[PDB]
mmCIF file of C-alpha atoms and ligand atoms in Angstrom:
data_model
loop_
_atom_site.group_PDB
_atom_site.id
_atom_site.type_symbol
_atom_site.label_atom_id
_atom_site.label_comp_id
_atom_site.label_asym_id
_atom_site.label_seq_id
_atom_site.Cartn_x
_atom_site.Cartn_y
_atom_site.Cartn_z
ATOM 1 C CA UNK J 3 36.783 -12.371 -23.211
ATOM 2 C CA UNK J 4 37.402 -10.059 -20.235
ATOM 3 C CA UNK J 5 37.701 -9.865 -16.423
ATOM 4 C CA UNK J 6 34.742 -9.116 -14.127
ATOM 5 C CA UNK J 7 34.189 -7.604 -10.675
ATOM 6 C CA UNK J 8 30.717 -7.483 -9.106
ATOM 7 C CA UNK J 9 30.730 -4.989 -6.259
ATOM 8 C CA UNK J 10 27.101 -4.011 -6.809
ATOM 9 C CA UNK J 11 24.483 -6.779 -6.250
ATOM 10 C CA UNK J 12 21.744 -4.147 -6.653
ATOM 11 C CA UNK J 13 22.522 -3.893 -10.380
ATOM 12 C CA UNK J 14 20.780 -6.683 -12.312
ATOM 13 C CA UNK J 15 22.107 -7.706 -15.743
ATOM 14 C CA UNK J 16 19.321 -7.396 -18.324
ATOM 15 C CA UNK J 17 20.660 -10.518 -20.060
ATOM 16 C CA UNK J 18 20.211 -12.646 -16.929
ATOM 17 C CA UNK J 19 16.703 -11.523 -16.035
ATOM 18 C CA UNK J 20 14.327 -14.112 -17.436
ATOM 19 C CA UNK J 21 10.604 -13.710 -17.972
ATOM 20 C CA UNK J 22 8.375 -16.061 -15.985
ATOM 21 C CA UNK J 23 5.020 -14.372 -15.815
ATOM 22 C CA UNK J 24 3.018 -11.145 -16.211
ATOM 23 C CA UNK J 25 1.569 -9.966 -12.860
ATOM 24 C CA UNK J 26 -0.006 -6.501 -13.118
ATOM 25 C CA UNK J 27 -0.590 -3.366 -15.213
ATOM 26 C CA UNK J 28 -1.667 -0.301 -13.232
ATOM 27 C CA UNK J 29 -1.919 3.364 -14.122
ATOM 28 C CA UNK J 30 1.706 4.242 -14.861
ATOM 29 C CA UNK J 31 3.464 0.934 -14.260
ATOM 30 C CA UNK J 32 3.272 -2.792 -14.825
ATOM 31 C CA UNK J 33 4.883 -5.724 -13.005
ATOM 32 C CA UNK J 34 6.293 -9.054 -14.164
ATOM 33 C CA UNK J 35 7.744 -12.096 -12.452
ATOM 34 C CA UNK J 36 11.266 -12.986 -13.517
ATOM 35 C CA UNK J 37 14.094 -15.348 -12.553
ATOM 36 C CA UNK J 38 17.566 -13.899 -12.106
ATOM 37 C CA UNK J 39 19.922 -16.496 -13.537
ATOM 38 C CA UNK J 40 23.503 -15.170 -13.720
ATOM 39 C CA UNK J 41 24.846 -18.742 -13.776
ATOM 40 C CA UNK J 42 22.783 -19.617 -16.856
ATOM 41 C CA UNK J 43 21.827 -22.832 -15.067
ATOM 42 C CA UNK J 44 18.065 -22.299 -15.429
ATOM 43 C CA UNK J 45 17.885 -21.642 -11.686
ATOM 44 C CA UNK J 46 17.964 -18.352 -9.875
ATOM 45 C CA UNK J 47 16.073 -16.167 -7.474
ATOM 46 C CA UNK J 48 12.493 -15.254 -8.341
ATOM 47 C CA UNK J 49 11.880 -11.496 -8.376
ATOM 48 C CA UNK J 50 9.159 -9.004 -9.228
ATOM 49 C CA UNK J 51 10.126 -6.430 -11.863
ATOM 50 C CA UNK J 52 8.345 -3.092 -12.205
ATOM 51 C CA UNK J 53 8.491 -0.997 -15.361
ATOM 52 C CA UNK J 54 7.162 2.313 -16.623
ATOM 53 C CA UNK J 55 4.743 2.452 -19.514
ATOM 54 C CA UNK J 56 5.963 5.874 -20.591
ATOM 55 C CA UNK J 57 9.366 7.214 -19.468
ATOM 56 C CA UNK J 58 8.507 10.905 -19.681
ATOM 57 C CA UNK J 59 10.853 13.197 -17.803
ATOM 58 C CA UNK J 60 8.150 13.479 -15.179
ATOM 59 C CA UNK J 61 7.330 9.773 -14.997
ATOM 60 C CA UNK J 62 10.993 8.776 -14.828
ATOM 61 C CA UNK J 63 11.770 11.288 -12.064
ATOM 62 C CA UNK J 64 8.863 9.918 -10.061
ATOM 63 C CA UNK J 65 9.998 6.347 -10.666
ATOM 64 C CA UNK J 66 13.531 7.174 -9.480
ATOM 65 C CA UNK J 67 12.034 8.887 -6.428
ATOM 66 C CA UNK J 68 9.953 5.773 -5.822
ATOM 67 C CA UNK J 69 13.022 3.537 -6.095
ATOM 68 C CA UNK J 70 15.079 5.625 -3.659
ATOM 69 C CA UNK J 71 12.194 5.489 -1.207
ATOM 70 C CA UNK J 72 11.906 1.674 -1.435
ATOM 71 C CA UNK J 73 15.662 1.228 -1.235
ATOM 72 C CA UNK J 74 15.662 3.339 1.945
ATOM 73 C CA UNK J 75 13.285 0.968 3.718
ATOM 74 C CA UNK J 76 14.332 -2.173 5.570
ATOM 75 C CA UNK J 77 11.521 -3.752 7.538
ATOM 76 C CA UNK J 78 9.711 -7.096 7.843
ATOM 77 C CA UNK J 79 6.407 -5.559 6.722
ATOM 78 C CA UNK J 80 7.670 -3.532 3.760
ATOM 79 C CA UNK J 81 8.296 -5.027 0.308
ATOM 80 C CA UNK J 82 12.026 -5.700 -0.202
ATOM 81 C CA UNK J 83 14.114 -3.617 -2.531
ATOM 82 C CA UNK J 84 16.490 -5.803 -4.524
ATOM 83 C CA UNK J 85 17.923 -3.473 -7.139
ATOM 84 C CA UNK J 86 17.421 -2.007 -10.571
ATOM 85 C CA UNK J 87 17.985 -3.045 -14.161
ATOM 86 C CA UNK J 88 19.068 -0.631 -16.885
ATOM 87 C CA UNK J 89 17.622 -2.597 -19.786
ATOM 88 C CA UNK J 90 17.594 -1.676 -23.505
ATOM 89 C CA UNK J 91 21.351 -1.152 -23.448
ATOM 90 C CA UNK J 92 21.059 0.896 -20.295
ATOM 91 C CA UNK J 93 18.530 3.251 -21.982
ATOM 92 C CA UNK J 94 15.531 2.115 -19.916
ATOM 93 C CA UNK J 95 14.970 1.499 -16.203
ATOM 94 C CA UNK J 96 13.301 -1.260 -14.210
ATOM 95 C CA UNK J 97 12.834 -1.845 -10.506
ATOM 96 C CA UNK J 98 13.773 -5.172 -9.009
ATOM 97 C CA UNK J 99 11.807 -6.176 -5.871
ATOM 98 C CA UNK J 100 10.689 -9.173 -3.932
ATOM 99 C CA UNK J 101 7.971 -11.309 -5.429
ATOM 100 C CA UNK J 102 5.113 -12.100 -3.080
ATOM 101 C CA UNK J 103 3.390 -15.380 -4.097
ATOM 102 C CA UNK J 104 -0.086 -14.475 -2.826
ATOM 103 C CA UNK J 105 -0.251 -11.015 -4.377
ATOM 104 C CA UNK J 106 -2.413 -8.289 -2.886
ATOM 105 C CA UNK J 107 -4.241 -8.705 0.411
ATOM 106 C CA UNK J 108 -7.392 -7.691 -1.398
ATOM 107 C CA UNK J 109 -7.214 -10.691 -3.774
ATOM 108 C CA UNK J 110 -5.975 -12.930 -0.991
ATOM 109 C CA UNK J 111 -8.903 -12.171 1.308
ATOM 110 C CA UNK J 112 -11.178 -12.705 -1.655
ATOM 111 C CA UNK J 113 -9.564 -15.922 -2.998
ATOM 112 C CA UNK J 114 -8.670 -17.569 0.312
ATOM 113 C CA UNK J 115 -11.384 -17.074 2.909
ATOM 114 C CA UNK J 116 -10.913 -20.733 3.868
ATOM 115 C CA UNK J 117 -7.617 -19.672 5.400
ATOM 116 C CA UNK J 118 -8.707 -16.457 7.060
ATOM 117 C CA UNK J 119 -10.300 -15.772 10.453
ATOM 118 C CA UNK J 120 -10.314 -12.833 12.879
ATOM 119 C CA UNK J 121 -6.985 -13.892 14.478
ATOM 120 C CA UNK J 122 -5.359 -13.643 11.021
ATOM 121 C CA UNK J 123 -7.010 -10.307 10.276
ATOM 122 C CA UNK J 124 -5.586 -8.945 13.542
ATOM 123 C CA UNK J 125 -2.124 -10.303 12.772
ATOM 124 C CA UNK J 126 -2.250 -8.562 9.378
ATOM 125 C CA UNK J 127 -3.655 -5.378 10.937
ATOM 126 C CA UNK J 128 -0.795 -5.376 13.425
ATOM 127 C CA UNK J 129 1.875 -5.878 10.769
ATOM 128 C CA UNK J 130 0.527 -2.996 8.702
ATOM 129 C CA UNK J 131 0.653 -0.643 11.678
ATOM 130 C CA UNK J 132 4.257 -1.654 12.326
ATOM 131 C CA UNK J 133 5.238 -1.100 8.702
ATOM 132 C CA UNK J 134 3.471 2.229 8.963
ATOM 133 C CA UNK J 135 5.246 3.099 12.261
ATOM 134 C CA UNK J 136 8.477 2.500 10.340
ATOM 135 C CA UNK J 137 7.560 4.848 7.451
ATOM 136 C CA UNK J 138 6.947 7.528 10.081
ATOM 137 C CA UNK J 139 10.538 7.356 11.294
ATOM 138 C CA UNK J 140 11.605 8.222 7.765
ATOM 139 C CA UNK J 141 8.936 10.930 7.680
ATOM 140 C CA UNK J 142 7.280 9.208 4.708
ATOM 141 C CA UNK J 143 3.570 9.737 3.881
ATOM 142 C CA UNK J 144 2.332 6.778 1.861
ATOM 143 C CA UNK J 145 -0.912 8.470 0.582
ATOM 144 C CA UNK J 146 -2.370 5.264 -0.860
ATOM 145 C CA UNK J 147 -3.086 2.703 1.865
ATOM 146 C CA UNK J 148 -5.590 0.059 0.711
ATOM 147 C CA UNK J 149 -5.674 -3.764 0.707
ATOM 148 C CA UNK J 150 -4.801 -3.755 -2.985
ATOM 149 C CA UNK J 151 -1.470 -2.048 -2.156
ATOM 150 C CA UNK J 152 -0.610 -4.505 0.646
ATOM 151 C CA UNK J 153 0.863 -7.842 -0.389
ATOM 152 C CA UNK J 154 0.815 -11.327 1.102
ATOM 153 C CA UNK J 155 4.066 -13.287 1.371
ATOM 154 C CA UNK J 156 2.294 -16.109 3.163
ATOM 155 C CA UNK J 157 -0.480 -16.951 5.647
ATOM 156 C CA UNK J 158 1.585 -15.254 8.392
ATOM 157 C CA UNK J 159 3.040 -12.165 6.714
ATOM 158 C CA UNK J 160 1.915 -9.116 4.782
ATOM 159 C CA UNK J 161 3.973 -6.189 3.523
ATOM 160 C CA UNK J 162 3.222 -2.629 2.472
ATOM 161 C CA UNK J 163 4.036 -1.769 -1.130
ATOM 162 C CA UNK J 164 2.910 0.767 -3.733
ATOM 163 C CA UNK J 165 5.335 3.550 -2.802
ATOM 164 C CA UNK J 166 4.743 5.478 -6.010
ATOM 165 C CA UNK J 167 2.758 8.235 -4.249
ATOM 166 C CA UNK J 168 4.900 8.497 -1.145
ATOM 167 C CA UNK J 169 5.933 11.981 0.034
ATOM 168 C CA UNK J 170 8.762 13.060 2.353
ATOM 169 C CA UNK J 171 7.987 15.554 5.122
ATOM 170 C CA UNK J 172 10.536 18.380 5.528
ATOM 171 C CA UNK J 173 11.895 18.618 9.064
ATOM 172 C CA UNK J 174 9.734 21.603 10.025
ATOM 173 C CA UNK J 175 6.400 20.597 8.471
ATOM 174 C CA UNK J 176 3.688 18.146 9.498
ATOM 175 C CA UNK J 177 1.736 17.812 6.260
ATOM 176 C CA UNK J 178 2.445 17.721 2.544
ATOM 177 C CA UNK J 179 0.054 19.557 0.237
ATOM 178 C CA UNK J 180 0.038 17.875 -3.136
ATOM 179 C CA UNK J 181 -1.846 19.330 -6.081
ATOM 180 C CA UNK J 182 -2.295 16.445 -8.507
ATOM 181 C CA UNK J 183 -3.996 15.845 -11.875
ATOM 182 C CA UNK J 184 -6.234 12.864 -12.529
ATOM 183 C CA UNK J 185 -8.092 10.415 -10.352
ATOM 184 C CA UNK J 186 -7.698 9.912 -6.627
ATOM 185 C CA UNK J 187 -8.587 6.950 -4.366
ATOM 186 C CA UNK J 188 -11.221 9.226 -2.858
ATOM 187 C CA UNK J 189 -13.011 6.608 -0.734
ATOM 188 C CA UNK J 190 -9.788 6.024 1.207
ATOM 189 C CA UNK J 191 -9.113 9.761 1.659
ATOM 190 C CA UNK J 192 -9.215 11.722 4.900
ATOM 191 C CA UNK J 193 -11.524 14.806 4.688
ATOM 192 C CA UNK J 194 -8.592 17.257 4.670
ATOM 193 C CA UNK J 195 -6.981 15.370 1.800
ATOM 194 C CA UNK J 196 -10.269 15.674 -0.093
ATOM 195 C CA UNK J 197 -10.862 19.339 0.685
ATOM 196 C CA UNK J 198 -7.283 20.677 0.866
ATOM 197 C CA UNK J 199 -4.997 18.044 -0.699
ATOM 198 C CA UNK J 200 -3.282 17.814 2.662
ATOM 199 C CA UNK J 201 -1.539 14.564 3.433
ATOM 200 C CA UNK J 202 0.130 13.540 6.681
ATOM 201 C CA UNK J 203 0.709 10.626 9.034
ATOM 202 C CA UNK J 204 -2.773 11.421 10.309
ATOM 203 C CA UNK J 205 -4.276 11.066 6.859
ATOM 204 C CA UNK J 206 -2.480 7.702 6.570
ATOM 205 C CA UNK J 207 -4.094 6.719 9.860
ATOM 206 C CA UNK J 208 -7.467 7.674 8.384
ATOM 207 C CA UNK J 209 -6.783 5.495 5.341
ATOM 208 C CA UNK J 210 -5.563 2.716 7.616
ATOM 209 C CA UNK J 211 -8.981 2.758 9.269
ATOM 210 C CA UNK J 212 -10.501 2.102 5.863
ATOM 211 C CA UNK J 213 -7.953 -0.707 5.371
ATOM 212 C CA UNK J 214 -9.178 -2.129 8.687
ATOM 213 C CA UNK J 215 -12.754 -1.879 7.411
ATOM 214 C CA UNK J 216 -11.811 -3.769 4.223
ATOM 215 C CA UNK J 217 -10.222 -6.625 6.158
ATOM 216 C CA UNK J 218 -13.339 -7.195 8.234
ATOM 217 C CA UNK J 219 -15.606 -7.076 5.170
ATOM 218 C CA UNK J 220 -13.460 -9.842 3.688
ATOM 219 C CA UNK J 221 -13.747 -7.935 0.388
ATOM 220 C CA UNK J 222 -17.388 -9.042 -0.012
ATOM 221 C CA UNK J 223 -19.183 -8.014 -3.213
ATOM 222 C CA UNK J 224 -21.381 -5.210 -1.907
ATOM 223 C CA UNK J 225 -19.231 -3.998 0.963
ATOM 224 C CA UNK J 226 -16.205 -2.268 -0.556
ATOM 225 C CA UNK J 227 -15.698 1.344 0.514
ATOM 226 C CA UNK J 228 -16.674 2.510 -2.994
ATOM 227 C CA UNK J 229 -19.863 0.394 -3.086
ATOM 228 C CA UNK J 230 -20.890 1.467 0.433
ATOM 229 C CA UNK J 231 -20.205 5.178 0.031
ATOM 230 C CA UNK J 232 -21.992 5.104 -3.311
ATOM 231 C CA UNK J 233 -25.085 3.558 -1.653
ATOM 232 C CA UNK J 234 -24.995 6.206 1.054
ATOM 233 C CA UNK J 235 -24.436 8.956 -1.528
ATOM 234 C CA UNK J 236 -26.788 7.730 -4.238
ATOM 235 C CA UNK J 237 -25.578 5.164 -6.778
ATOM 236 C CA UNK J 238 -26.567 7.266 -9.771
ATOM 237 C CA UNK J 239 -24.388 10.275 -8.986
ATOM 238 C CA UNK J 240 -21.504 11.047 -11.315
ATOM 239 C CA UNK J 241 -18.408 13.194 -11.606
ATOM 240 C CA UNK J 242 -17.843 15.908 -9.032
ATOM 241 C CA UNK J 243 -21.289 15.333 -7.583
ATOM 242 C CA UNK J 244 -19.847 12.199 -5.961
ATOM 243 C CA UNK J 245 -16.982 14.247 -4.479
ATOM 244 C CA UNK J 246 -19.283 17.054 -3.255
ATOM 245 C CA UNK J 247 -21.529 14.505 -1.524
ATOM 246 C CA UNK J 248 -18.672 12.452 -0.133
ATOM 247 C CA UNK J 249 -17.157 15.551 1.457
ATOM 248 C CA UNK J 250 -20.445 16.868 2.864
ATOM 249 C CA UNK J 251 -21.253 13.387 4.250
ATOM 250 C CA UNK J 252 -17.874 12.813 5.926
ATOM 251 C CA UNK J 253 -17.848 16.369 7.333
ATOM 252 C CA UNK J 254 -21.070 15.595 9.204
ATOM 253 C CA UNK J 255 -20.140 12.222 10.693
ATOM 254 C CA UNK J 256 -21.215 9.908 7.873
ATOM 255 C CA UNK J 257 -19.093 6.760 8.168
ATOM 256 C CA UNK J 258 -18.711 3.258 6.711
ATOM 257 C CA UNK J 259 -20.962 0.868 8.652
ATOM 258 C CA UNK J 260 -19.696 -1.785 11.049
ATOM 259 C CA UNK J 261 -19.169 -4.913 8.915
ATOM 260 C CA UNK J 262 -21.203 -8.036 9.752
ATOM 261 C CA UNK J 263 -19.536 -10.202 12.379
ATOM 262 C CA UNK J 264 -17.175 -7.393 13.336
ATOM 263 C CA UNK J 265 -16.465 -6.871 17.076
ATOM 264 C CA UNK J 266 -17.479 -3.488 18.465
ATOM 265 C CA UNK J 267 -13.947 -2.982 19.769
ATOM 266 C CA UNK J 268 -12.535 -3.337 16.261
ATOM 267 C CA UNK J 269 -15.170 -1.066 14.752
ATOM 268 C CA UNK J 270 -14.324 1.479 17.431
ATOM 269 C CA UNK J 271 -10.709 1.481 16.197
ATOM 270 C CA UNK J 272 -11.935 2.320 12.706
ATOM 271 C CA UNK J 273 -14.074 5.147 14.077
ATOM 272 C CA UNK J 274 -11.220 6.708 16.081
ATOM 273 C CA UNK J 275 -9.136 6.645 12.910
ATOM 274 C CA UNK J 276 -12.016 8.323 11.123
ATOM 275 C CA UNK J 277 -11.726 11.505 13.143
ATOM 276 C CA UNK J 278 -12.343 14.777 11.352
ATOM 277 C CA UNK J 279 -10.040 16.275 13.935
ATOM 278 C CA UNK J 280 -6.595 15.420 12.511
ATOM 279 C CA UNK J 281 -4.788 15.698 15.856
ATOM 280 C CA UNK J 282 -7.196 13.439 17.669
ATOM 281 C CA UNK J 283 -6.552 10.401 15.470
ATOM 282 C CA UNK J 284 -4.416 7.814 17.266
ATOM 283 C CA UNK J 285 -0.845 7.147 16.159
ATOM 284 C CA UNK J 286 0.268 3.912 14.450
ATOM 285 C CA UNK J 287 2.218 3.012 17.608
ATOM 286 C CA UNK J 288 -1.027 3.482 19.599
ATOM 287 C CA UNK J 289 -2.740 1.306 17.041
ATOM 288 C CA UNK J 290 -0.207 -1.564 17.011
ATOM 289 C CA UNK J 291 -0.124 -1.710 20.832
ATOM 290 C CA UNK J 292 -3.928 -1.766 21.076
ATOM 291 C CA UNK J 293 -4.182 -4.424 18.362
ATOM 292 C CA UNK J 294 -1.434 -6.626 19.820
ATOM 293 C CA UNK J 295 -3.045 -6.289 23.251
ATOM 294 C CA UNK J 296 -6.421 -7.374 21.870
ATOM 295 C CA UNK J 297 -4.564 -10.302 20.287
ATOM 296 C CA UNK J 298 -2.623 -11.104 23.424
ATOM 297 C CA UNK J 299 -5.659 -10.827 25.661
ATOM 298 C CA UNK J 300 -7.359 -13.809 24.029
ATOM 299 C CA UNK J 301 -7.290 -17.193 25.772
ATOM 300 C CA UNK J 302 -5.211 -18.491 22.895
HETATM 301 O O1 0X5 V 1 3.544 -4.479 -6.721
HETATM 302 C C1 0X5 V 1 2.438 -4.937 -6.949
HETATM 303 N N1 0X5 V 1 2.194 -6.260 -6.916
HETATM 304 C C2 0X5 V 1 3.107 -7.277 -6.611
HETATM 305 C C3 0X5 V 1 4.433 -7.100 -6.211
HETATM 306 C C4 0X5 V 1 5.221 -8.189 -5.900
HETATM 307 N N2 0X5 V 1 4.728 -9.414 -5.987
HETATM 308 C C5 0X5 V 1 3.474 -9.635 -6.365
HETATM 309 N N3 0X5 V 1 2.982 -10.941 -6.435
HETATM 310 C C6 0X5 V 1 1.906 -11.311 -7.181
HETATM 311 O O2 0X5 V 1 1.250 -10.557 -7.876
HETATM 312 C C7 0X5 V 1 1.472 -12.743 -7.186
HETATM 313 C C8 0X5 V 1 -0.032 -12.985 -7.323
HETATM 314 C C9 0X5 V 1 0.895 -13.214 -8.513
HETATM 315 C C10 0X5 V 1 2.641 -8.575 -6.660
HETATM 316 C C11 0X5 V 1 1.316 -4.017 -7.267
HETATM 317 C C12 0X5 V 1 0.726 -3.967 -8.541
HETATM 318 CL CL1 0X5 V 1 1.257 -4.971 -9.852
HETATM 319 C C13 0X5 V 1 -0.317 -3.095 -8.779
HETATM 320 C C14 0X5 V 1 -0.798 -2.273 -7.781
HETATM 321 C C15 0X5 V 1 -0.235 -2.315 -6.523
HETATM 322 C C16 0X5 V 1 0.807 -3.180 -6.262
HETATM 323 CL CL2 0X5 V 1 1.478 -3.209 -4.663
#
């Protein structure tokens, strides 16, 4: 036996990370739930563990970029970084984060309407803006805002996750142009992201507007942004034809419809976010203030 000195809590011992459950398998990654049990006493902290399907030089570099980004964020409405695990004898790499019991907001809205009203939706809306205000201070562009990439800790708290697509803005530039292979979340995309692959805080604001739309549809069967845009576009269209028509439609003021039961003031917030003019979209700080004020202005 040997001596031991742990001056790095962000390094998790593969041997002590215990499988509990399989949570998700996306496009490049998958997530499990584990217990970290250094004391071998069958009790430890519960954590979410993300791993790569294929550690290509490119995939790995992205993953490491993603981990640095998460590690650099400390905020109540951003998923907590916990550390990493160099499993397979330190020849593989896994991300250790907080586990959020209720999973994505999208599922939560869907599976727990009994628990959700407009006061909740506003609380969640507010927290997302604040998490987003925080990314801004790091000059991070998330690029993938949607209720599926927001997670529910409990009834009273949601957190932004999914930082795999996040870009850093150089000091002297206000957009990031990213030329990327494969599929895009096109129905969440600002027009300039669609037409020019330009991403910015403003394009995040656009996407946020769509997030706001999703919340007030309560993720109802026919009302998702893809289902609604596809109705407007023609449900039979395929391939690029969908993109062509989406772009043309957005460019000429075609917009998601006000969800049933949704207050005009809230729909108006969506529409301001959905401004073709990039510089005329409100900021996240504008958004959080307006949303908290709407919340505060109620009798209760
Ligand atoms: O990171 C994710 N999901 C998490 C993270 C932490 N905790 C949870 N908690 C749960 O899934 C609970 C419901 C079982 C989910 C995730 C996945 Cl797997 C796919 C796409 C986008 C995202 Cl952000």
